[PDB]
Symmetry: C3
Subunit: 169 residues, 3 copies
Protein backbone atom coordinates (compact mmCIF):
# COMPACT_ATOMS: atom_id res chain seq x y z
CA UNK A 1 0.00 0.00 0.00
CA UNK A 2 2.89 2.35 0.92
CA UNK A 3 4.30 4.72 -1.75
CA UNK A 4 7.47 6.32 -0.28
CA UNK A 5 8.73 9.67 -1.53
CA UNK A 6 11.34 10.49 1.15
CA UNK A 7 14.34 8.86 2.80
CA UNK A 8 14.09 7.46 6.29
CA UNK A 9 16.32 5.81 8.89
CA UNK A 10 15.30 2.35 10.16
CA UNK A 11 16.67 1.55 13.63
CA UNK A 12 16.80 -2.16 14.51
CA UNK A 13 18.49 -4.35 17.11
CA UNK A 14 20.92 -7.17 16.24
CA UNK A 15 23.14 -9.69 18.02
CA UNK A 16 26.36 -11.38 16.95
CA UNK A 17 26.29 -15.18 16.72
CA UNK A 18 29.75 -16.80 17.14
CA UNK A 19 28.68 -20.13 15.62
CA UNK A 20 28.07 -19.36 11.95
CA UNK A 21 29.79 -15.96 12.04
CA UNK A 22 26.48 -14.12 11.63
CA UNK A 23 24.49 -11.18 12.86
CA UNK A 24 20.98 -12.05 13.97
CA UNK A 25 17.91 -9.78 14.14
CA UNK A 26 15.83 -9.29 17.26
CA UNK A 27 12.27 -9.98 16.08
CA UNK A 28 9.64 -7.27 16.42
CA UNK A 29 8.00 -4.46 14.45
CA UNK A 30 8.59 -0.83 13.57
CA UNK A 31 6.08 1.71 12.34
CA UNK A 32 7.77 4.01 9.81
CA UNK A 33 6.43 7.27 8.41
CA UNK A 34 7.21 6.60 4.74
CA UNK A 35 7.70 2.85 4.36
CA UNK A 36 4.66 1.37 6.10
CA UNK A 37 5.19 -1.28 8.77
CA UNK A 38 8.54 -2.98 9.10
CA UNK A 39 8.19 -6.58 10.27
CA UNK A 40 11.20 -8.44 11.52
CA UNK A 41 10.34 -12.17 11.48
CA UNK A 42 12.10 -14.88 13.46
CA UNK A 43 15.47 -16.22 12.32
CA UNK A 44 15.63 -18.47 9.27
CA UNK A 45 12.10 -17.74 8.07
CA UNK A 46 11.54 -19.44 4.71
CA UNK A 47 10.61 -17.44 1.64
CA UNK A 48 7.02 -18.79 1.49
CA UNK A 49 6.38 -17.93 5.14
CA UNK A 50 8.09 -14.53 4.77
CA UNK A 51 5.55 -13.24 2.22
CA UNK A 52 2.64 -14.04 4.57
CA UNK A 53 3.78 -11.85 7.47
CA UNK A 54 1.73 -8.80 8.42
CA UNK A 55 3.75 -5.83 7.24
CA UNK A 56 4.90 -3.80 4.28
CA UNK A 57 8.59 -4.78 4.47
CA UNK A 58 9.53 -8.18 5.93
CA UNK A 59 13.00 -9.13 7.08
CA UNK A 60 14.66 -12.30 8.31
CA UNK A 61 18.31 -13.01 9.14
CA UNK A 62 19.60 -16.45 8.09
CA UNK A 63 22.07 -18.49 10.11
CA UNK A 64 24.11 -21.63 9.50
CA UNK A 65 26.98 -22.22 7.05
CA UNK A 66 26.49 -21.50 3.40
CA UNK A 67 24.40 -18.40 4.12
CA UNK A 68 27.43 -16.18 3.34
CA UNK A 69 28.45 -13.92 0.47
CA UNK A 70 31.67 -13.32 2.39
CA UNK A 71 34.69 -15.44 3.32
CA UNK A 72 34.49 -15.31 7.06
CA UNK A 73 37.16 -17.06 9.10
CA UNK A 74 34.96 -19.60 10.85
CA UNK A 75 37.94 -20.56 13.05
CA UNK A 76 37.23 -17.39 15.06
CA UNK A 77 34.31 -15.04 15.64
CA UNK A 78 35.80 -11.68 14.53
CA UNK A 79 34.46 -11.65 10.99
CA UNK A 80 30.66 -11.47 10.90
CA UNK A 81 28.02 -11.21 8.22
CA UNK A 82 24.39 -10.22 8.18
CA UNK A 83 22.73 -12.41 5.54
CA UNK A 84 19.16 -11.16 5.33
CA UNK A 85 16.13 -11.85 3.17
CA UNK A 86 13.93 -8.82 2.73
CA UNK A 87 10.44 -8.80 1.28
CA UNK A 88 9.56 -5.43 -0.22
CA UNK A 89 5.79 -5.33 -0.49
CA UNK A 90 5.46 -1.58 -1.01
CA UNK A 91 4.55 0.03 -4.34
CA UNK A 92 8.13 1.08 -5.15
CA UNK A 93 11.71 -0.05 -5.34
CA UNK A 94 13.73 0.91 -2.25
CA UNK A 95 17.47 1.52 -2.04
CA UNK A 96 19.30 0.79 1.19
CA UNK A 97 21.86 3.62 1.00
CA UNK A 98 24.01 3.05 4.03
CA UNK A 99 24.25 1.33 7.35
CA UNK A 100 25.89 2.08 10.66
CA UNK A 101 26.34 0.21 13.92
CA UNK A 102 26.57 1.10 17.54
CA UNK A 103 27.26 -1.42 20.29
CA UNK A 104 24.32 -1.75 22.67
CA UNK A 105 24.71 -1.49 26.46
CA UNK A 106 25.94 -4.65 28.18
CA UNK A 107 24.50 -6.36 31.27
CA UNK A 108 25.62 -3.56 33.61
CA UNK A 109 23.36 -1.18 31.67
CA UNK A 110 26.16 1.43 31.81
CA UNK A 111 29.00 0.15 29.62
CA UNK A 112 29.41 -0.67 25.94
CA UNK A 113 31.82 -2.86 24.02
CA UNK A 114 34.75 -0.84 22.61
CA UNK A 115 35.58 -3.73 20.31
CA UNK A 116 36.67 -1.78 17.19
CA UNK A 117 35.42 -2.85 13.75
CA UNK A 118 35.41 -2.12 10.04
CA UNK A 119 31.96 -2.09 8.44
CA UNK A 120 31.41 -3.41 4.94
CA UNK A 121 28.33 -2.24 3.04
CA UNK A 122 27.42 -1.79 -0.63
CA UNK A 123 24.19 0.08 -1.54
CA UNK A 124 21.48 -2.49 -2.28
CA UNK A 125 18.23 -2.20 -4.21
CA UNK A 126 15.19 -3.90 -2.69
CA UNK A 127 13.05 -4.64 -5.76
CA UNK A 128 9.31 -4.44 -5.07
CA UNK A 129 7.23 -7.66 -5.01
CA UNK A 130 10.45 -9.52 -4.56
CA UNK A 131 12.43 -11.12 -1.78
CA UNK A 132 15.91 -9.59 -1.83
CA UNK A 133 19.25 -10.50 -0.34
CA UNK A 134 20.68 -7.81 1.95
CA UNK A 135 24.09 -8.10 3.55
CA UNK A 136 26.69 -6.18 5.48
CA UNK A 137 29.92 -7.38 7.05
CA UNK A 138 31.75 -6.37 10.18
CA UNK A 139 35.26 -7.36 11.08
CA UNK A 140 36.09 -6.89 14.76
CA UNK A 141 39.43 -6.63 16.61
CA UNK A 142 38.25 -9.12 19.24
CA UNK A 143 36.08 -12.28 19.06
CA UNK A 144 32.37 -11.84 19.46
CA UNK A 145 30.97 -13.85 22.40
CA UNK A 146 28.23 -13.50 25.03
CA UNK A 147 29.73 -10.47 26.75
CA UNK A 148 29.91 -8.15 23.77
CA UNK A 149 27.49 -9.29 21.05
CA UNK A 150 24.72 -6.68 21.31
CA UNK A 151 24.44 -4.10 18.50
CA UNK A 152 22.12 -1.37 17.22
CA UNK A 153 21.68 -1.19 13.48
CA UNK A 154 20.85 1.93 11.49
CA UNK A 155 19.75 1.57 7.87
CA UNK A 156 18.85 4.41 5.55
CA UNK A 157 16.01 3.70 3.13
CA UNK A 158 15.35 5.83 0.07
CA UNK A 159 12.94 5.60 -2.89
CA UNK A 160 13.94 4.22 -6.26
CA UNK A 161 16.73 2.15 -7.72
CA UNK A 162 19.20 4.61 -9.30
CA UNK A 163 22.84 3.68 -8.76
CA UNK A 164 26.22 4.92 -9.96
CA UNK A 165 26.90 3.91 -13.57
CA UNK A 166 30.64 3.44 -14.21
CA UNK A 167 31.91 5.21 -17.34
CA UNK A 168 34.59 4.28 -19.89
CA UNK A 169 38.27 3.69 -19.03
CA UNK B 1 6.23 27.44 16.14
CA UNK B 2 8.11 24.90 13.96
CA UNK B 3 6.23 21.82 12.65
CA UNK B 4 8.86 19.50 11.06
CA UNK B 5 7.89 17.00 8.38
CA UNK B 6 11.34 15.94 7.11
CA UNK B 7 14.63 14.67 8.51
CA UNK B 8 17.62 16.95 8.80
CA UNK B 9 21.26 16.79 9.86
CA UNK B 10 22.40 19.13 12.66
CA UNK B 11 26.14 19.90 12.56
CA UNK B 12 27.62 21.16 15.84
CA UNK B 13 31.08 21.58 17.35
CA UNK B 14 32.21 19.83 20.56
CA UNK B 15 35.35 19.49 22.69
CA UNK B 16 36.52 16.70 24.96
CA UNK B 17 37.02 17.59 28.63
CA UNK B 18 39.54 15.32 30.43
CA UNK B 19 38.34 16.30 33.92
CA UNK B 20 34.86 14.80 34.20
CA UNK B 21 35.23 12.57 31.13
CA UNK B 22 32.75 14.66 29.14
CA UNK B 23 32.13 16.19 25.76
CA UNK B 24 31.30 19.88 25.86
CA UNK B 25 29.35 21.95 23.31
CA UNK B 26 30.68 25.10 21.71
CA UNK B 27 27.92 27.66 22.31
CA UNK B 28 26.27 29.34 19.33
CA UNK B 29 23.24 29.03 17.06
CA UNK B 30 22.15 27.20 13.94
CA UNK B 31 19.31 28.04 11.59
CA UNK B 32 17.72 24.81 10.34
CA UNK B 33 15.24 24.42 7.50
CA UNK B 34 12.78 22.13 9.29
CA UNK B 35 13.44 22.48 13.03
CA UNK B 36 13.49 26.23 13.59
CA UNK B 37 16.46 27.77 15.38
CA UNK B 38 18.87 25.57 17.27
CA UNK B 39 20.31 27.34 20.31
CA UNK B 40 23.32 25.91 22.05
CA UNK B 41 23.52 27.54 25.51
CA UNK B 42 26.60 27.73 27.70
CA UNK B 43 27.74 24.70 29.69
CA UNK B 44 25.76 23.63 32.73
CA UNK B 45 22.72 25.79 31.99
CA UNK B 46 19.98 25.02 34.52
CA UNK B 47 16.59 23.78 33.42
CA UNK B 48 14.78 27.03 34.34
CA UNK B 49 17.26 29.15 32.39
CA UNK B 50 17.24 26.70 29.46
CA UNK B 51 13.54 27.23 28.69
CA UNK B 52 14.03 31.01 28.44
CA UNK B 53 16.62 30.94 25.64
CA UNK B 54 15.72 32.36 22.24
CA UNK B 55 15.28 29.35 19.98
CA UNK B 56 13.10 26.42 19.05
CA UNK B 57 15.44 23.70 20.33
CA UNK B 58 17.78 24.48 23.25
CA UNK B 59 20.78 22.39 24.21
CA UNK B 60 23.29 22.41 27.05
CA UNK B 61 26.07 19.96 27.89
CA UNK B 62 26.56 19.23 31.61
CA UNK B 63 29.94 18.68 33.23
CA UNK B 64 31.13 17.46 36.62
CA UNK B 65 30.79 14.01 38.22
CA UNK B 66 27.40 12.43 38.54
CA UNK B 67 26.28 13.75 35.16
CA UNK B 68 26.87 10.29 33.61
CA UNK B 69 24.64 7.46 32.42
CA UNK B 70 27.84 5.58 31.65
CA UNK B 71 30.64 4.05 33.74
CA UNK B 72 33.57 6.03 32.49
CA UNK B 73 37.01 5.25 33.86
CA UNK B 74 37.73 8.58 35.52
CA UNK B 75 41.34 7.42 36.12
CA UNK B 76 42.00 8.22 32.44
CA UNK B 77 40.46 10.35 29.71
CA UNK B 78 39.72 7.72 27.01
CA UNK B 79 36.08 7.08 27.87
CA UNK B 80 33.92 10.15 27.30
CA UNK B 81 30.25 10.97 27.54
CA UNK B 82 28.06 13.73 26.20
CA UNK B 83 25.41 14.35 28.86
CA UNK B 84 23.07 16.91 27.34
CA UNK B 85 19.79 18.54 28.28
CA UNK B 86 17.67 19.40 25.28
CA UNK B 87 14.59 21.58 25.30
CA UNK B 88 12.25 20.73 22.44
CA UNK B 89 9.96 23.72 22.00
CA UNK B 90 8.66 22.79 18.54
CA UNK B 91 5.14 21.50 17.89
CA UNK B 92 6.21 17.86 17.53
CA UNK B 93 8.20 15.06 19.06
CA UNK B 94 11.65 14.67 17.47
CA UNK B 95 13.74 11.51 17.26
CA UNK B 96 17.51 11.76 17.21
CA UNK B 97 18.21 8.82 14.87
CA UNK B 98 21.97 8.68 14.76
CA UNK B 99 25.13 10.54 15.46
CA UNK B 100 28.60 10.62 13.96
CA UNK B 101 31.86 12.32 14.83
CA UNK B 102 34.78 13.69 12.96
CA UNK B 103 37.89 15.11 14.63
CA UNK B 104 38.31 18.82 13.92
CA UNK B 105 41.57 20.30 12.61
CA UNK B 106 44.24 20.92 15.25
CA UNK B 107 46.31 24.06 15.81
CA UNK B 108 48.31 23.58 12.59
CA UNK B 109 45.05 23.92 10.64
CA UNK B 110 46.19 21.00 8.44
CA UNK B 111 46.17 17.87 10.61
CA UNK B 112 43.54 15.92 12.51
CA UNK B 113 43.68 13.51 15.42
CA UNK B 114 43.74 9.87 14.25
CA UNK B 115 42.84 8.77 17.75
CA UNK B 116 40.51 5.83 16.93
CA UNK B 117 37.22 5.44 18.81
CA UNK B 118 34.03 3.44 19.20
CA UNK B 119 30.85 5.51 19.25
CA UNK B 120 27.93 4.57 21.46
CA UNK B 121 24.48 5.91 20.56
CA UNK B 122 20.90 4.74 21.11
CA UNK B 123 18.06 6.51 19.23
CA UNK B 124 16.47 9.05 21.58
CA UNK B 125 13.07 10.74 21.50
CA UNK B 126 12.98 14.44 22.33
CA UNK B 127 9.45 14.89 23.70
CA UNK B 128 7.95 18.29 22.88
CA UNK B 129 7.47 20.86 25.69
CA UNK B 130 9.94 18.87 27.69
CA UNK B 131 13.59 18.99 28.62
CA UNK B 132 15.14 15.68 27.57
CA UNK B 133 18.35 13.87 28.38
CA UNK B 134 20.49 13.14 25.31
CA UNK B 135 23.71 11.15 25.51
CA UNK B 136 26.34 9.46 23.41
CA UNK B 137 29.59 7.85 24.45
CA UNK B 138 32.96 7.62 22.79
CA UNK B 139 35.79 5.38 23.86
CA UNK B 140 39.16 6.39 22.43
CA UNK B 141 42.44 4.46 22.01
CA UNK B 142 44.43 7.37 23.48
CA UNK B 143 43.70 9.87 26.30
CA UNK B 144 41.93 13.05 25.35
CA UNK B 145 43.96 16.17 26.23
CA UNK B 146 44.56 19.66 24.83
CA UNK B 147 46.22 18.50 21.62
CA UNK B 148 43.44 16.30 20.31
CA UNK B 149 40.11 17.26 21.91
CA UNK B 150 38.33 19.04 19.04
CA UNK B 151 35.40 17.25 17.38
CA UNK B 152 32.58 17.86 14.90
CA UNK B 153 29.24 16.33 15.77
CA UNK B 154 26.57 15.27 13.30
CA UNK B 155 23.09 14.49 14.57
CA UNK B 156 20.16 13.38 12.45
CA UNK B 157 16.77 14.73 13.51
CA UNK B 158 13.51 13.23 12.30
CA UNK B 159 9.82 13.84 13.12
CA UNK B 160 7.86 11.69 15.53
CA UNK B 161 8.56 9.16 18.23
CA UNK B 162 8.14 5.71 16.63
CA UNK B 163 10.74 3.17 17.76
CA UNK B 164 11.35 -0.54 17.32
CA UNK B 165 8.95 -2.63 19.41
CA UNK B 166 10.54 -5.95 20.46
CA UNK B 167 8.33 -9.00 19.83
CA UNK B 168 7.87 -12.25 21.76
CA UNK B 169 10.68 -14.74 22.48
CA UNK C 1 17.67 23.36 -13.94
CA UNK C 2 17.39 21.36 -10.67
CA UNK C 3 15.88 23.04 -7.58
CA UNK C 4 16.43 20.65 -4.62
CA UNK C 5 14.18 20.76 -1.57
CA UNK C 6 15.21 17.52 0.19
CA UNK C 7 18.37 15.79 1.37
CA UNK C 8 19.80 12.87 -0.55
CA UNK C 9 22.67 10.40 -0.29
CA UNK C 10 25.15 10.25 -3.21
CA UNK C 11 26.95 6.90 -3.49
CA UNK C 12 30.20 6.96 -5.48
CA UNK C 13 33.23 4.72 -5.93
CA UNK C 14 36.80 5.80 -5.08
CA UNK C 15 40.31 4.32 -5.03
CA UNK C 16 43.33 5.17 -2.91
CA UNK C 17 46.44 6.35 -4.77
CA UNK C 18 49.71 5.70 -2.86
CA UNK C 19 51.73 8.18 -4.94
CA UNK C 20 50.35 11.59 -3.98
CA UNK C 21 48.46 10.33 -0.93
CA UNK C 22 45.09 10.88 -2.61
CA UNK C 23 41.70 9.35 -3.15
CA UNK C 24 40.64 9.17 -6.78
CA UNK C 25 37.11 9.01 -8.22
CA UNK C 26 35.93 6.32 -10.60
CA UNK C 27 34.44 8.28 -13.51
CA UNK C 28 30.79 7.77 -14.42
CA UNK C 29 27.35 9.25 -13.80
CA UNK C 30 24.55 9.07 -11.28
CA UNK C 31 20.93 10.07 -11.71
CA UNK C 32 19.64 11.58 -8.46
CA UNK C 33 16.05 12.35 -7.53
CA UNK C 34 16.61 15.86 -6.16
CA UNK C 35 19.96 17.06 -7.50
CA UNK C 36 19.75 16.35 -11.22
CA UNK C 37 22.54 14.38 -12.88
CA UNK C 38 25.81 13.86 -11.07
CA UNK C 39 28.74 13.72 -13.48
CA UNK C 40 32.07 12.43 -12.29
CA UNK C 41 34.70 13.56 -14.82
CA UNK C 42 38.14 12.03 -15.30
CA UNK C 43 40.95 12.81 -12.87
CA UNK C 44 42.57 16.24 -12.96
CA UNK C 45 39.91 17.86 -15.14
CA UNK C 46 40.64 21.59 -15.45
CA UNK C 47 38.13 24.18 -14.33
CA UNK C 48 37.30 25.33 -17.90
CA UNK C 49 36.64 21.76 -19.06
CA UNK C 50 34.70 20.95 -15.88
CA UNK C 51 31.96 23.52 -16.58
CA UNK C 52 31.31 22.04 -20.04
CA UNK C 53 30.43 18.52 -18.87
CA UNK C 54 26.89 17.24 -19.32
CA UNK C 55 25.37 17.24 -15.85
CA UNK C 56 23.97 19.33 -13.05
CA UNK C 57 26.81 18.70 -10.57
CA UNK C 58 30.31 17.99 -11.90
CA UNK C 59 33.12 16.49 -9.86
CA UNK C 60 36.80 15.79 -10.43
CA UNK C 61 39.46 14.50 -8.03
CA UNK C 62 42.91 16.12 -8.36
CA UNK C 63 46.17 14.24 -7.94
CA UNK C 64 49.82 15.23 -7.63
CA UNK C 65 51.60 17.16 -4.86
CA UNK C 66 50.32 20.54 -3.84
CA UNK C 67 46.69 19.47 -4.23
CA UNK C 68 46.39 19.08 -0.43
CA UNK C 69 44.74 21.06 2.36
CA UNK C 70 46.19 18.48 4.74
CA UNK C 71 49.71 17.57 5.89
CA UNK C 72 49.91 14.01 4.70
CA UNK C 73 53.04 12.02 5.43
CA UNK C 74 54.17 11.40 1.86
CA UNK C 75 56.83 8.99 3.19
CA UNK C 76 54.02 6.42 3.58
CA UNK C 77 50.55 5.82 2.18
CA UNK C 78 48.43 5.76 5.39
CA UNK C 79 47.28 9.37 5.34
CA UNK C 80 45.07 10.12 2.34
CA UNK C 81 43.12 13.10 1.09
CA UNK C 82 40.32 13.57 -1.39
CA UNK C 83 40.94 16.94 -3.06
CA UNK C 84 37.95 17.49 -5.31
CA UNK C 85 36.64 20.28 -7.50
CA UNK C 86 32.87 20.36 -7.68
CA UNK C 87 30.81 22.39 -10.11
CA UNK C 88 27.35 23.13 -8.72
CA UNK C 89 25.20 24.07 -11.69
CA UNK C 90 21.83 23.69 -9.95
CA UNK C 91 19.63 26.62 -8.93
CA UNK C 92 20.60 26.45 -5.24
CA UNK C 93 23.46 26.25 -2.81
CA UNK C 94 24.10 22.70 -1.58
CA UNK C 95 25.65 21.64 1.72
CA UNK C 96 27.60 18.41 1.91
CA UNK C 97 26.62 17.41 5.47
CA UNK C 98 28.59 14.26 6.06
CA UNK C 99 30.53 11.50 4.44
CA UNK C 100 31.17 7.86 5.19
CA UNK C 101 33.33 5.14 3.68
CA UNK C 102 33.12 1.44 3.26
CA UNK C 103 35.91 -0.67 1.78
CA UNK C 104 34.85 -2.30 -1.50
CA UNK C 105 35.28 -6.04 -2.16
CA UNK C 106 38.77 -7.11 -3.21
CA UNK C 107 39.76 -9.34 -6.13
CA UNK C 108 38.30 -12.48 -4.51
CA UNK C 109 34.86 -10.81 -4.63
CA UNK C 110 34.23 -12.12 -1.08
CA UNK C 111 36.58 -10.25 1.26
CA UNK C 112 37.08 -6.63 2.26
CA UNK C 113 39.99 -4.71 3.71
CA UNK C 114 39.74 -4.42 7.51
CA UNK C 115 42.34 -1.67 7.44
CA UNK C 116 40.95 0.60 10.21
CA UNK C 117 40.79 4.37 9.66
CA UNK C 118 39.76 7.72 11.09
CA UNK C 119 37.68 9.87 8.75
CA UNK C 120 38.09 13.63 8.67
CA UNK C 121 35.23 15.72 7.28
CA UNK C 122 33.95 19.27 7.83
CA UNK C 123 30.55 20.26 6.37
CA UNK C 124 31.13 22.12 3.09
CA UNK C 125 28.91 24.49 1.14
CA UNK C 126 28.85 24.04 -2.64
CA UNK C 127 27.97 27.55 -3.86
CA UNK C 128 25.85 27.54 -7.02
CA UNK C 129 27.41 28.68 -10.33
CA UNK C 130 30.76 28.12 -8.75
CA UNK C 131 33.47 25.50 -8.72
CA UNK C 132 34.08 24.52 -5.10
CA UNK C 133 36.81 22.70 -3.25
CA UNK C 134 35.60 19.58 -1.42
CA UNK C 135 37.88 17.50 0.77
CA UNK C 136 37.90 14.70 3.28
CA UNK C 137 40.82 12.90 4.88
CA UNK C 138 41.32 9.33 5.96
CA UNK C 139 44.16 8.06 8.08
CA UNK C 140 44.62 4.30 7.92
CA UNK C 141 46.42 1.84 10.25
CA UNK C 142 48.16 0.19 7.28
CA UNK C 143 49.60 1.56 4.00
CA UNK C 144 47.26 1.77 1.05
CA UNK C 145 48.50 -0.27 -1.94
CA UNK C 146 47.02 -2.33 -4.78
CA UNK C 147 45.51 -5.01 -2.56
CA UNK C 148 43.34 -2.79 -0.39
CA UNK C 149 42.67 0.53 -2.15
CA UNK C 150 39.02 0.15 -3.20
CA UNK C 151 36.41 2.23 -1.34
CA UNK C 152 32.73 3.19 -1.52
CA UNK C 153 31.93 6.79 -0.69
CA UNK C 154 28.65 8.06 0.74
CA UNK C 155 27.95 11.78 0.72
CA UNK C 156 24.84 13.45 2.06
CA UNK C 157 23.62 16.46 0.09
CA UNK C 158 21.14 18.96 1.50
CA UNK C 159 19.70 22.28 0.27
CA UNK C 160 21.01 25.64 1.39
CA UNK C 161 24.08 27.02 3.08
CA UNK C 162 23.19 27.44 6.77
CA UNK C 163 26.00 26.47 9.15
CA UNK C 164 26.66 26.68 12.87
CA UNK C 165 27.47 30.23 13.98
CA UNK C 166 29.82 30.25 17.00
CA UNK C 167 28.68 32.54 19.84
CA UNK C 168 30.61 34.69 22.31
CA UNK C 169 33.20 33.34 24.78
Amino acid sequence: DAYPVESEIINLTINGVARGNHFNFVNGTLQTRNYGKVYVAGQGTSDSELVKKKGDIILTSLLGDGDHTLNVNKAESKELELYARVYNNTKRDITVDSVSLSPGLNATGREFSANKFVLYFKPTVLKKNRINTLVFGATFDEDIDDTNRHYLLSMRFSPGNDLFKVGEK
